[PDB]
Each structure stands twice: as structure tokens, then as C-alpha cells.
Write a protein that binds this ligand. Structure first.
Ligand SMILES: NC(=O)c1ccc(-c2cc([C@H]3C[C@@H]4CC[C@H]3N4)cnc2F)nc1
Ligand SMILES: NC(=O)c1ccc(-c2cc([C@H]3C[C@@H]4CC[C@H]3N4)cnc2F)nc1
Ligand SMILES: NC(=O)c1ccc(-c2cc([C@H]3C[C@@H]4CC[C@H]3N4)cnc2F)nc1
Ligand SMILES: NC(=O)c1ccc(-c2cc([C@H]3C[C@@H]4CC[C@H]3N4)cnc2F)nc1
Ligand SMILES: NC(=O)c1ccc(-c2cc([C@H]3C[C@@H]4CC[C@H]3N4)cnc2F)nc1
Ligand SMILES: *[C@@H]1O[C@H](CO)[C@@H](O)[C@H](O)[C@H]1NC(C)=O
Ligand SMILES: *[C@@H]1O[C@H](CO)[C@@H](O)[C@H](O)[C@H]1NC(C)=O
Ligand SMILES: *[C@@H]1O[C@H](CO)[C@@H](O)[C@H](O)[C@H]1NC(C)=O
Ligand SMILES: *[C@@H]1O[C@H](CO)[C@@H](O)[C@H](O)[C@H]1NC(C)=O
Ligand SMILES: *[C@@H]1O[C@H](CO)[C@@H](O)[C@H](O)[C@H]1NC(C)=O
Lengths: 205, 205, 205, 206, 206
């Protein structure tokens, strides 16, 4: 307890909070999805609801420490309000995301942060044909809402979505699920934005 | 990091917050809409639900800085709670607006602020005839709830709503969409209020 | 800006907040309704939903100032959390009221305050007969929940509800709408409570 | 204004907040219900929705004052966040309670507090037979969730629920409504807990 | 009052908050469920809704005190925001948990804490066959979301879920209900996580 209280005090009480990334000190966030369930499709509004968790990983110099000065602590859990977190947003959602897990992240001595929020998302998707053998494909882009590619870049560790926790008695079975980095240009804005495109192909079980 | 922390400290910790516009120092807010989806119509209550994002832009002297005094920083991202934002309100909503994007704005060295909230809005609209070839037209006014034209004026850069992110497999297709400045007089109040009228004509796809 | 920051500082930072009205210093609140839409009726639960805005007006000595000492400022906008507001409550609601406008009031140099919240209210009302020529009548009382007539009195400027913003394509048309001061006694309590009774007569369009 | 600001400052800024009742300084809370409407029944989930207000009354020494030292003020209104309030909970609810009135209480010079929250409650109730002449009976217990009878006791002033504000055009009419003190033992916990059992008998209006 | 205000001040104002368990100072949380109602099943989405309360118990050195230094106070009630509480999470929920009881815990002089939140949970469950004599079985794992078995361990006092407060007029009857410790490995993570698996077998009332 004593060593950890001291470490947290030194990282969070002694400085102002990290103000986020800049063009001079950009940040790369690693994203990965673990898909748990396609809960419902609404064919009258073209909305689909997913439950998943989203692994987020980044690294800051201001969160480094030497374990020997703090009783060999290599990592700790902390409330996500104590730290900056990236503003990763689904681009075609139709409702506010519902949070299904505690807002707690893990910080490691090299300055890396891992944050794995579980979410339920409603997004735009036409499920016509879901009851056929071929199924339907739907897609949703995840990226920073406010930072361009000059401040936040994204990457994945793999292009395969993790399906090993997928609910075996779901109404829908997954035929494939990929997660892929893309670059986008928008009408509002001259600079490239980065996203990860989650593409899921599914049908009725 | 260091230069930005210093800049934010100088703009926000050294003064009281901007108390909003006055008759002596009025403010012009530029509005523009990007329509993403007409999600649903309810013909039994005459309510329609849109998903869009609303570009808001204004300029304050108290947010100016010289880039050379702060490591050539020309702009930064900041929480919308750190700054004043205009109280832009839909005049015929039937539910509280749901916020679909992070509450983060971008401030530029000339004192200009850009804020682009994504929203889902339920508003008053009769969808009878939506299943015909001619479609239906619906309209909603956006403006300040509490400031008259003597404190807040509005403008648009174009009268065409941006449709380039419109969901291609929506239940509804858009025939036209305009955004137009207007002046209104109300029973309660002797002074002109300004709004932007969003007029959307649509039908079943 | 400078004059207004100074005025707000002198009214709000230099004293404790107004603790509300007393028997020695009672307060009169003026109420008026502007009815926008009867959104739905539920004949299986006897609930009706209205959208309206409610004009509230009162006057305090502690909010007076001389305009000449503050750059000729005659009024200003301020967050409703910065000031006391009356606890006006619908007496037959079935859900929490939903707030559809920003919580911002206007204070004038004579000490008068105006606050105009837009609301959606579900309340108790039997809509049987709404589809006939004669229509139905429904009523809801608005008053302080906790202050009797010895601390808060109410009045209206007119007994006619403002119908000039009523949605022209509503499912329901308004035949009449009145707002009238009344005195009530309740089982819990020996002292008179004051309310304004909103009586609306309507039918299917 | 001046006298009241001064009184509130003396009661709330000069001390730490009341930490709640103890075995040495127990508290009696008086409860009473005023039933406004049975809004709906759901026979597919066995849930019923009531709208009521709940009168709560208790007394603390730390809220006493002499009226003569404060301009003859005998009582005042204050936000319920400024004071401790009892944690009265429905024991068979199926949704969070919805609050329909402002969170404001009235404190009197003898140290007594009155707080009357209006609420909408969904609770467990089988409405099968509601459309008959005999109706259905449903019941819900209200009590402290965390304090036993050694710290919080409950009482009623009357066993009759107040029906004088009952909505006359409700879908349901009330045949009877009682509010009655009871003592319960729970498996988790060695002390008796006190509740008030609200029993309502109703049917479809005819 | 005076002794308790003093005790609370000494435990909460004089130090920083407990930063949670570590590999060097791990923590064991005891869990137990009391099932009140299966409120609904949705066979079109495979979601089931339960109402229960979850008894949580743990022990910290930093919450110890000697009763003789504080007027023989052996325990007290305190807001759950004043203390650390474990981040126990259902692993197959489809909605945020709804809280049905006040967020108040009880701390005892030996440093032990008891916290008993009542909750409504929607979780993944196929109710096909619920209308038969054999019924359906459904399961949900409860565990820390962020702490592995090296920081938080779990146990139960019994493997039988408490059914003595189960609503007698529910749409569903319970045939059996167990609560059992398990060890899991996940794709994200090399270290063991501990959970308690709540297994409930039920059918439509007949
Ligand atoms: N260079 C600048 O001054 C500046 C100003 C504002 C923004 C911005 C951009 C976005 C949109 C870009 C992408 C598509 C829709 C939103 N996400 C959202 N919010 C913002 F504040 N970006 C850059
Ligand atoms: N001249 C004054 O002292 C004053 C006082 C109050 C208001 C005001 C006006 C409005 C309504 C005007 C428009 C239509 C409905 C609302 N938005 C809302 N909230 C307000 F506080 N405006 C000016
Ligand atoms: N004389 C006193 O000490 C005192 C105490 C409490 C109240 C009070 C009254 C009400 C009810 C009056 C009206 C009908 C139902 C509620 N609204 C609600 N909340 C309250 F706190 N009024 C006066
Ligand atoms: N003597 C003690 O150490 C102790 C500890 C905890 C509790 C307690 C009891 C309850 C339950 C008792 C009743 C049935 C369910 C809940 N309401 C809830 N929350 C609590 F914190 N009571 C006593
Ligand atoms: N020491 C580390 O490198 C590390 C990093 C992150 C996490 C973590 C793990 C989890 C998942 C474990 C279990 C199954 C899915 C989630 N709950 C959630 N939130 C977290 F922050 N644990 C360990
Ligand atoms: C930390 O590491 C070193 C061994 O390299 C050891 O001397 C020390 O005692 C360890 N643990 C603590 C709690 O200090
Ligand atoms: C800032 O601008 C000057 C002038 O062009 C440049 O020479 C200097 O290297 C810049 N400093 C930075 C990017 O920190
Ligand atoms: C205030 O009023 C006087 C008299 O009309 C005028 O001369 C002065 O310019 C006004 N404005 C300010 C900011 O003092
Ligand atoms: C309190 O009431 C008495 C009436 O008996 C009166 O004389 C006195 O003025 C009042 N006190 C104050 C401080 O107003
Ligand atoms: C605590 O209990 C003792 C008996 O052991 C009693 O005599 C004393 O009055 C109590 N109060 C204290 C120690 O403050």
C-alpha cells in the first residue's frame, strides 16, 4: 500500500495532467476488438446492436517510473478519470454507447497504458438477407473524433477480430470479422483522419 | 507537452471565464449541418429522429495567442467544459438531444473555436406520405434559446447541407436538404432572434 | 466583458447565496405557459405527454445594481445554477420532467429574473373521447412543492395560454387552453398552497 | 434573508455533517404514504407501477435552535443534500425509483425534519384477476436497507394510506390501502430490521 | 455522534485513500447471491433479466480501530464513495447494471467491510425450452474486470444460492441455483482470473 500511494502521488499530484498529443509529440494507439454478441437487429430502422470489448493501448513518457524507487512495483490499476484516455468514437452510431465495465486502466512502469472498456453499441446496418445462407455484411469505423493523423495514429496487432468469447447460443453466427486500419478525408477538414474499420459478416443461426 | 501545458494555464487559470457575449461585444456563430441518417419516423406521434453533426464556429479576443511565445503551437484540443460554448437549441425537439461524440473543441491562435458535436434529435414532423414518390418535407430551427440577435447572430457558409456521409442503406433517401438563416419574433419577447432553418425533403428508399 | 465580469463577481462572489423566501420576505412568482405540442396520449395508462415552455418571473433586492457603475449594462444571462430558482412542480406527473432547453436565466438591473425552461411532461389524463367532435379536457396544477402561500405566491399576466407556437401538424388540435391561479389545502398540511391550473381541451385533428 | 443566512451558516458550516444514527443515539422515522395513481400493470412480467408521495419525519438535537437568536424564524426550507436523510428503500422494486419532486426538506426549530419525496415505483406484483369484482392484492415493504432496528425504528401515525389525492379517472380503483409496521429477520444479519408494509387492494374501474 | 465523527475523521481525512490490492498485499472477496426474481426473458434476443442482491465482504488493515478509543463503537455505516469497493462485474451482461439499493456499506472494527448492493441485470441466455417441464439452464460469471488472481481472489461461504426471498408469484420458478468459484484464462491476458459462476435452472410457473 505505502509504496503504491507514494507512486500515485508522485505521478498525479506533482504535475498538471497530460494535455493530450500534439504535432510535435504524436501518439499511436493500438486497437483490437473482442466480439461477444450480436444482440439484436432492427430491420425497420436498420440498426444493429453489438456487445464487445475494445482493447486500447498507448505509451507516455510522463507515466514512466523506476521500479526500484517504489518497492518493485511494475504496474498498477487506476481510475480512468486520473489519466488522459483517447477519444475513440464509432462513426456510425445511432445511440450513446453504453458502458458495461468499470472505468479502470492499467499503467506499466515503461509508461504504457492498457484500457479495455466493454460496450454496447447501436450502429447503422441493413440486416436484409440475414436469414439466408450468404448472410449480411456490416461495417463501422472507429477513430478519434477530434485529432487528425498528425496527432493520433492507430494500428492493430492482427487483422482478425477475436471470436473466442463469442456467445455460442446467440441468434446470429459470425462468418468473418476483420479489423483494418484506414485513412479517410472528410468534407469539413483538409487533413487525414485514421480509423480502424470493423467488418462483420453474419447470419441467423 | 510543456509548451501546451503552459499555453492552457495562461488562457484558463489566469483569468475568470468568458461570461458570454453582450450588446457591446456581440458574437457571430457560424453553423453547418452534416446529415448522417434519418433513423426512424413515428407516424402515430409525428416525431422523426435524425443523426447528424453540427459544425459550430466562433471567435474571441480572449483566446488569442502569439505562436512564437509557445513553441509554434497554432491550435489545440480542449474539453468543452474549459470554455464557453453557444447555447444552440432545436426549437421543435420532443426529447433531450443525445450526444454521440466527445465534448472536445479545437481552439486556434487567432481566437477562433471549432466545435462539432454529433447528435441524435427527435423533433416534430408529420411523415404521412413518406412512402410516396413525392415524399415529405420537414423543418427544424436551430438557434440560441436565451440570446437575441443583439448578442448572438448566426450565419452559414453554404445553404446546402452536406450529404456526403449520408448512410447509403438508410430506410429513407434524401431529395434535398437546405440550411438557411432566418429572423424570428416571438410572443414572449420584443427583440429579433436568429436561427438556422434545416429543411429536409425525404422519402422511403 | 470587463464590466460584466465585474458585475457578476459583485453579485455572486461577495455574499452567500439567497436562501429563498421567508414569511417576513415572501416572493411572488409570475407563471405563463406556451404550449407547443400534445405529443401522445396513452389510453391504456391514462397518461398524456405535452411539450411546452414555462415562463417564470420573480424579483429580488439582492440582485439590483445601478447601470452607471457597470458600463450601462441593464441585463445579463447567467447559468441557473448561479442563482436561486423557484421549485415549481407539476402535481400529477407520472415521469420526471425532461428538460429541452439550456438552464440559463436573464437578470435585469431592477432585480427581476426571467427563466423560461422548455419541458416535456407526462401527466395523468383520461383521453377517452379524444376522437370525437367535443374532445377531452385535461388539467394539471403547477406550484411550489415545499413552500406554502405564506412564502411563495403565484400569479399570471393573462388567463389565456399562448398557442401561437402550437405545432400546426400535431395529431391533436387545441380547442381551448387556460391558466388560472387557485388556492389548495392538502391532508398533510394546515396552510394554503398556491398553484396555477393549466386546463387544456383538445381533440384529434 | 440576513437572519436565515446566519442560521444556515451556524447549523451547516460550523460542524461536520451528522454521521447518521448509532446504537447509543438511535432514531425513529415516521412514514406515511399518499397514493396518487396506479399507472400500469404488466401481466407478462408481473410488475406494477405506482405514483405516490412518502412523508418522512425525524428529529435531531444538532438541528435545534432558539428562534429569538435568529429573528423569530421557526422553520426553514433547505436542499436535502445539506442534511442527512434516511435510506428508506422498497424491498421488491424492479427498477430504480424515479424522483418526481424537488429534493428539498423543511427543518423546524425543535430539530425535527420533514421530507416528502414524490416517486414512481415499479415493483413485483401479479395482477391476474384485476379485471374481476374481487380484484388483486399487492404488497411492498419499505425500510432502511443498512440500519437494523437498534439504529432506526419506524412508525406510522395511522394505518390508513391517504387516498384523498387518488386520481379519480385512473384505470384502477382502490378497494383498500394500509400501511403497517413489521419486524423481519434476514439470513445475512443477526439483528431485527423494521419495515412498513404497504398493502393495496385494487381492481379495474367499473 | 461525537465519537463516530471523530472515528470517521481519523480513518478518512488523515490519510490518502486505499489504492486497492497489490501482488504483495492481495485481497480475498467473499461473494454470495440472494435471488429475488427472474423478471423477464426475451426469446427474440436471448436476454434474461434478474433481480438479486449480492453480498460482498473483504478486510483491510487500514480500516482497523480499537473500540475503547472511540466510545465502544464496534461498527459503522458509511457511504460507499468514502471507501474502496471491489470492481465485481458480470461477464456476459448486455446492459449497464441498474442499482436498486443505497450505496452504503458497513465497516467493522477488525477492518472488515460488508456491502450488499441490490441489482437488476440483463445477461446472455437462451430461454428456448423454458415452457417445458425440464426448463432451461443459464449461467453468468462474476469477477473483477481488471485484477487477476494475483491481486483479487474470490470465495463463497456456500455453493447454494439463497432462494428464501424468491418472489412466490414470479412468472418463473427456480428449480436450482448454485454459486461456484472458477479459474479462467482469457485471450488478452497470460494470468489467471477468478470468478464465481452463478448457474440457475428455471421454468415457467405451473
Ligand atoms: N484544424 C482545425 O482547426 C480543426 C478544427 C476542428 C476539428 C474537428 C474535426 C471533427 C471532424 C473530423 C472527423 C469527421 C467528423 C469529425 N471527425 C470534429 N471535431 C473537431 F473539432 N479538427 C480540426
Ligand atoms: N429582455 C429580457 O430581459 C429577456 C429575458 C428573458 C429572455 C428569454 C427568452 C427565451 C425565449 C425567446 C426564444 C423563444 C423561446 C425562448 N427562446 C428564453 N429564455 C429567456 F431567458 N430573453 C430576454
Ligand atoms: N410546516 C412545516 O414544517 C412543513 C413541513 C413540510 C412541508 C412540505 C409539504 C409538502 C406537501 C405540500 C404540497 C402537497 C404535497 C406536498 N406539496 C412537501 N414537502 C414538504 F416538505 N410543508 C411544511
Ligand atoms: N452487523 C453487521 O456487521 C452488518 C453488516 C452489513 C449489514 C447490511 C445489511 C443489509 C441487508 C439487511 C436487509 C436485507 C437485505 C439488506 N437489507 C444490507 N447492507 C448492509 F450493509 N447489516 C449489518
Ligand atoms: N498487466 C497487464 O499487461 C494487463 C493489462 C490490462 C489488463 C486488463 C484486463 C482486462 C481483461 C481481463 C478479463 C477478461 C477481459 C478483461 N477482463 C480488462 N481490463 C484490463 F485493464 N490486465 C492486465
Ligand atoms: C525488490 O528487489 C530487490 C532484489 O533485486 C530486493 O533487494 C528488494 O527487497 C525487493 N523488494 C522490496 C519490497 O523492496
Ligand atoms: C519555431 O519557429 C521558428 C521560426 O521559423 C523555427 O526556426 C523553430 O525551430 C521552431 N520551434 C519549434 C518547432 O519548436
Ligand atoms: C454609458 O452612458 C453614457 C451616457 O449616455 C455614455 O456617454 C457612455 O458612452 C455609455 N457607455 C459606457 C461604456 O460607459
Ligand atoms: C420577535 O417577535 C417579537 C414579538 O413578540 C417582536 O417584538 C420582535 O421584534 C421579534 N424579534 C426580531 C429580532 O425581529
Ligand atoms: C465502554 O464500555 C465500558 C465497559 O467496558 C464502560 O464502562 C464505558 O462507560 C464505555 N465507554 C467508554 C470507554 O467510553
Amino acid at each position: 500500500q505505502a509504496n503504491l500511494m507514494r507512486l500515485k502521488s508522485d505521478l498525479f499530484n506533482r504535475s498538471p495532467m497530460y494535455p493530450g498529443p500534439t504535432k510535435d509529440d504524436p501518439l499511436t494507439v493500438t486497437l483490437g476488438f473482442t466480439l461477444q454478441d450480436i444482440v439484436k437487429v432492427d430491420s425497420s430502422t436498420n440498426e444493429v446492436d453489438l456487445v464487445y470489448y475494445e482493447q486500447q493501448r498507448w505509451k507516455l513518457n510522463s507515466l514512466m517510473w523506476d521500479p526500484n524507487e517504489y518497492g518493485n512495483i511494475t504496474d498498477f490499476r487506476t481510475s480512468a478519470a486520473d489519466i488522459w484516455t483517447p477519444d475513440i468514437t464509432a462513426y456510425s452510431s445511432t445511440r450513446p454507447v453504453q458502458v458495461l465495465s468499470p472505468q479502470i486502466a492499467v499503467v506499466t512502469h515503461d509508461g504504457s497504458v492498457m484500457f479495455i472498456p466493454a460496450q454496447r453499441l447501436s450502429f447503422m446496418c441493413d440486416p436484409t438477407g440475414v436469414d439466408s445462407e450468404e448472410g449480411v455484411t456490416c461495417a463501422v469505423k472507429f477513430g478519434s473524433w477530434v485529432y487528425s493523423g498528425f496527432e493520433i495514429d492507430l494500428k492493430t496487432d492482427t487483422d482478425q477480430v477475436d471470436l473466442s468469447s463469442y456467445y455460442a447460443s446467440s441468434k446470429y453466427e459470425i462468418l468473418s470479422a476483420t479489423q483494418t486500419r484506414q485513412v479517410q478525408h472528410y468534407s469539413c477538414c483538409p487533413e487525414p483522419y485514421i480509423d480502424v474499420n470493423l467488418v462483420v459478416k453474419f447470419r441467423e443461426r
